[PDB]
Amino acid sequence: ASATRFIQWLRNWASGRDLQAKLQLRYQEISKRTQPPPKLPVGPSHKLSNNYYCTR
């Protein structure tokens, strides 16, 4: 038998609680193509005035 309902009882019985968190575990919440094009933020520089290398 390959039916999940009866098998899930066996794997839970034989040492420790299972059911959730599978071996494969790549079904839901796996985002393909990452995200829409983002904008990377700038640090303490980039913005002009008082950006001398004498201070840095």
Binding site: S45, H46, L48, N51, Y52, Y53, C54, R56
Partner: protein
């Protein structure tokens, strides 16, 4: 017997009267970033990069211009000297094209080595950049006057040492073109030295053109044959 004691960062050095600030700094081991000054050529205060602040003075004087008198404490690493070098470097590169990949000069470039060490990391610049129409000077010297920083060193070279008198400044402000106005084919003796005189990639060898970058080729010393002087 004709010797003046002066201080470079507080260190004693003896110099001949008439010598410049940069000449006095060469004695101790210091080297102020420069663009116009040359060991063989004359003195002009064009670019104003060799700014060095001497204490008890309101304005910063160039290393080219001032002759050293008695009692000066030349400060090379002060708060104002660093801001002077960072300032002018931003002005020099505001109206200079992004040509480092297409430039014949690579690692040998004076603008590259100095802007990394003395100049600022980032530029405030937003809009501008002037473009200069290139003039065909000769088949021996390739000339792209867009990259020229109007330093006036080649003009002095052709006038004082080469003695040909063809190059000259034409126009005012941004619109200043270095070169011959009459579009004359400049070919004379010592014309293969003007490519080495120019600190930037404005004047370059046309027969050499594009083959290797300065860092890639291994240098070897040799005496040149087929010449009387050697």
């Amino acid at each position: 017997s004709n010797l003046i004691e002066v201080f470079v960062d507080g260190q004693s050095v003896m110099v001949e009267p008439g010598t410049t600030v940069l000449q006095a700094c060469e004695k101790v081991g210091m080297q102020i970033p420069r663009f116009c000054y040359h060991e063989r050529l004359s003195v002009a205060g064009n670019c104003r990069m060799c700014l060095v602040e001497i204490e008890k003075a309101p304005k910063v004087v160039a290393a080219c211009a001032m002759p050293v008198m008695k009692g000066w404490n030349i400060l090379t690493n002060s708060e104002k000297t660093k801001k002077a070098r960072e300032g002018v470097m931003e002005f020099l590169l505001a109206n200079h094209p992004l040509d480092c990949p297409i430039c014949d000069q690579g690692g040998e470039c004076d603008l590259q080595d100095q802007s990394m060490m003395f100049g600022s990391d980032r530029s405030r610049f937003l809009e501008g950049k002037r473009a200069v129409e290139d003039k065909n000077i000769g088949p021996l010297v390739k000339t792209i006057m867009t990259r020229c920083i109007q330093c006036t060193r080649c003009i002095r070279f052709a006038s004082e040492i080469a003695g040909v008198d063809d190059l000259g400044t034409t126009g005012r402000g941004n619109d200043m073109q270095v070169g011959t106005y009459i579009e004359k084919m400049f070919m004379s003796e010592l014309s293969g030295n003007i490519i080495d005189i120019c600190p930037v990639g404005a004047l370059t060898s046309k027969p050499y053109a594009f083959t290797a970058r300065p860092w890639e080729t291994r240098k070897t010393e040799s005496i040149d044959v087929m010449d009387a002087v050697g």
